[PDB]
Design the sequence.
């Protein structure tokens, strides 16, 4: 327990020095407004990437459907040819692709729901930052008055 | 509610 | 949403609120002392009395 | 800061008025969706304005008290100067008296 | 935790000193005016490439 | 649309608001004090007396 | 991030110093008159070459 006590004492001393440097309200406030805006931009970029991914999956799904259609056309040609083996190969290609497409669709639906939720969340975030700015102005006025009052009280 | 208010204005 | 310490906005709000509340209480006490003094109270009374 | 809040409050009222004008235009247009969006904007702004007004009133009272305190302070410094002059005269006399007493 | 606080304090201190020097009405307005004009020119070049 | 704080369009609005608020507040406080002094009020009355 | 912002502020200050040295209208005006004529001549020469 002695080692723990020593660590705690060192930690307490370090914490005290750090808080004093960042004690002023204005310095803390400036950092916060800049940070939330930056975070929103980062979130937007992430959302854009997610949207792009969703678009890509849809394009891939469309491509898969197109590929299946192409295989079907080949199968029709094989029937005209009269070769049983050629037709069978085309059918096999269609089946594996179809299974993959079904799996992709389920994944896409889940992804789409998450993306929609994120968009809604972003709108809420925009309302919150605006509210914070109003709160900051009120806080600044109160702080200035309090500092003046304390000095007067001391006299 | 807005539609009802709008309708009243439209009325006259 | 969590209100975790790491977020910059959350940390700033807690520190500011505690400091402001303590200062306000101190300010109120200072105001009361001025009110408590006889001269401050007397001046308001005197002004009404003086004009007539 | 008090002036800024008042200006902000006025701006908020102006913004609400602008939204109302847009809503009127939407009604003329006949599109239900456009009108609804304008209404939502007005409601959030109104709530913010009410909160600001309460904060402003508290701030105004504090500011008024400070102004009164400043006037009191001015009277006090003037009194101190008079006190200082009296103290200086007494101190000079006391020092001279002590030396005389020693002899 | 302590290291993060120190980094934040250093950043805040640097920003506070920097903004006052930065906040000059004549310099800020001139810089902003110069930047927007430059940006417009860049956009035209991009538009030309698109047109091409 | 958003960009960064350094960019002129976003920054210009912030600098102007801060500068305007500070200038207005300082001017208003000084003006009120001059009005409060008894001598200024007396001078206006004196001028009328001087004129007749 | 901070360094980039600092550089912009420095650049604005530098720009202000530079314009003041060349602020006088007559030196700039003479140069401008010479430049447009030179540009026109180059354009004319190019036009002549195209015509040729």
Sequence:
């Amino acid at each position: 327990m002695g080692l723990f006590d020593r660590i705690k004492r060192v930690v307490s001393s370090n914490l005290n020095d750090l808080v004093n440097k960042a004690e002023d309200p204005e310095k803390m406030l400036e950092q916060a407004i800049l940070e939330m805006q930056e975070d929103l931009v980062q979130l937007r970029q992430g959302v854009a990437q997610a949207i792009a991914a969703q678009k890509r999956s849809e394009k891939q799904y469309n491509d898969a459907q197109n590929e299946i259609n192409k295989w079907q056309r080949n199968a029709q040609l094989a029937l005209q040819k009269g070769d049983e083996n050629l037709a069978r190969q085309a059918l096999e290609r269609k089946k594996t692709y179809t299974d993959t497409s079904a799996a992709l669709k389920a994944s896409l639906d889940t992804q789409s729901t998450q993306v929609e939720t994120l968009k809604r969340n972003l709108i809420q975030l925009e309302s919150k930052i605006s509210e914070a700015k109003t709160k900051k102005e009120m806080l600044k006025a109160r702080i200035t008055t309090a500092k003046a009052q304390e000095q007067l009280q001391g006299m | 509610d807005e539609l009802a208010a709008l309708k009243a204005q439209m009325l006259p | 949403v969590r209100g975790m310490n790491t977020s910059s906005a959350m940390s700033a709000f807690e520190r500011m609120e505690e400091k402001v509340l303590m200062q306000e209480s101190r300010a109120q006490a200072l105001g009361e002392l001025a009110g408590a003094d006889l001269e401050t109270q007397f001046a308001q009374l005197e002004g009404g009395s003086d004009v007539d």
Q: What stands out?
A: DSSP finds two helices and no strands in chain D.
